[PDB]
C-alpha cells in the first residue's frame, strides 16, 4: 500500500514510520515545508504508526536527537517515538478491511490530517492549537503537549489494569479533537477502510 506523507507546516519536520520493532520503508525522512515522501507498507501490517518529529539534529551517520518524537536517536526509526507525538495509526487488510485512527494518547506535537487516497471511507483529523492551550503541567519543555500517563504514571491515567475513565486531562484533548483517541479506553473513533487502501498523512493541514 501507499503512504504519501505531506509537510504542509511552515517548519521542517522529520517524519517517522514504524511498527514497533522495525522501520516502515526507510523509517524516516526529513521534510522541509512543502515536501512530500511516499512509502511503501507491506500488506496486512499491524499496528503501524506515522508521526512527526521536531527540532532534530542528525549527523551523517544518521545519529542524533529530536526535541519531540525521538526514536532512540536515529534518523531512520525502527521503535516508536518519545511523547509528545500526535499519532497516525493503522492496521491493514486484517480479514477485508483496513482501520485507521489518530491518537492523542501519547500526547500531541503537530496537527494532522490522515485521509484515504482511494473511495469508501472518510479520513480523520486533529488540527486544533492544542500546544497553545495545553494545560500548564502537561506542557513539554522541548515542545508539544504531553498526555497525563506520561506526566504522572498513575493507573488511572495509564489505564494500567484495563479499567479507567476519562479525566480532566483526557477531556482537554477530546475538547479540541473529538475524532482522535483521548485516552486508552476512549470510545473508538477508528475508521474501517477497504483492504489495501492508500492514504495521505498531511501535517499542519490547515496551514
Amino acid at each position: 500500500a501507499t503512504f504519501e506523507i505531506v509537510n504542509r507546516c511552515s517548519y521542517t519536520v522529520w517524519a517517522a514510520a514504524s511498527k514497533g520493532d522495525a522501520a516502515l520503508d526507510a523509517g524516516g525522512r526529513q521534510l522541509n515545508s512543502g515536501e512530500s515522501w511516499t512509502i511503501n507498507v507491506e500488506p496486512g501490517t499491524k499496528g503501524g504508526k506515522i508521526w512527526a518529529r521536531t527540532d532534530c539534529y542528525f549527523d551523517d551517520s544518521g545519529s542524533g536527537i529530536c526535541k519531540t518524537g525521538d526514536c532512540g536517536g536515529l534518523l531512520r526509526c525502527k521503535r516508536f517515538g518519545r511523547p509528545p507525538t500526535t499519532l497516525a495509526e493503522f492496521s491493514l487488510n486484517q480479514y477485508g478491511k483496513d482501520y485507521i485512527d489518530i491518537s492523542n494518547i501519547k500526547g500531541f506535537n503537530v496537527p494532522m490530517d490522515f485521509s484515504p487516497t482511494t473511495r469508501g471511507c472518510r479520513g480523520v483529523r486533529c488540527a486544533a492549537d492544542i500546544v497553545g492551550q495545553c494545560p500548564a503541567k502537561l506542557k513539554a519543555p522541548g515542545g508539544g503537549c504531553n498526555d497525563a500517563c506520561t506526566v504522572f504514571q498513575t493507573s488511572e491515567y495509564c489505564c494500567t489494569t484495563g479499567k479507567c475513565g476519562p479525566t480532566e486531562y483526557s477531556r482537554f484533548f477530546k475538547r479540541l479533537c473529538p475524532d482522535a483517541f483521548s485516552y486508552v479506553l476512549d470510545k473508538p473513533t477508528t475508521v474501517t477502510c477497504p483492504g489495501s487502501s492508500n492514504y495521505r498523512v498531511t501535517f499542519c493541514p490547515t496551514a
Side-chain angles (χ1 to χ4, degrees), residues 7 16 26 29 38 58 72 82 114 132 141 143 146 149-150 174 180 201 203:
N7 181 18
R29 216 204 87 176
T38 296
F58 294 113
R82 181 178 193 260
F114 190 10
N146 279 317
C149 175
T150 290
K174 199 62 163 183
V201 177
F203 297 114

Side-chain angles (χ1 to χ4, degrees), residues 58-143:
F58 294 113
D59 60 24
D60 263 89
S61 82
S63 183
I65 195 159
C66 297
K67 296 200 171 178
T68 71
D70 192 88
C71 64
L74 293 195
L75 178 62
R76 298 171 193 86
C77 285
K78 62 145 298 193
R79 64 161 265 241
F80 290 135
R82 181 178 193 260
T85 50
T86 323
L87 295 174
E89 308 187 302
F90 46 88
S91 294
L92 313 167
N93 306 103
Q94 305 295 298
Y95 306 104
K97 301 295 184 181
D98 278 9
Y99 302 89
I100 68 169
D101 64 80
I102 291 173
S103 164
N104 280 325
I105 285 170
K106 302 301 178 189
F108 176 99
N109 67 334
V110 174
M112 170 188 284
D113 192 274
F114 190 10
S115 283
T117 58
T118 57
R119 219 186 173 290
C121 50
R122 78 163 213 267
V124 289
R125 188 177 291 180
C126 169
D129 192 6
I130 279 166
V131 181
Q133 300 287 18
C134 187
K137 287 183 190 181
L138 301 182
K139 269 196 168 283

Side-chain angles (χ1 to χ4, degrees), residues 156-180:
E156 191 63 15
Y157 293 138
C158 307
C159 219
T160 58
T161 63
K163 297 171 277 286
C164 66
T167 74
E168 276 312 283
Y169 295 123
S170 79
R171 286 186 182 90
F172 163 76
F173 286 88
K174 199 62 163 183
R175 173 167 70 80
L176 281 164
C177 283
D179 277 324

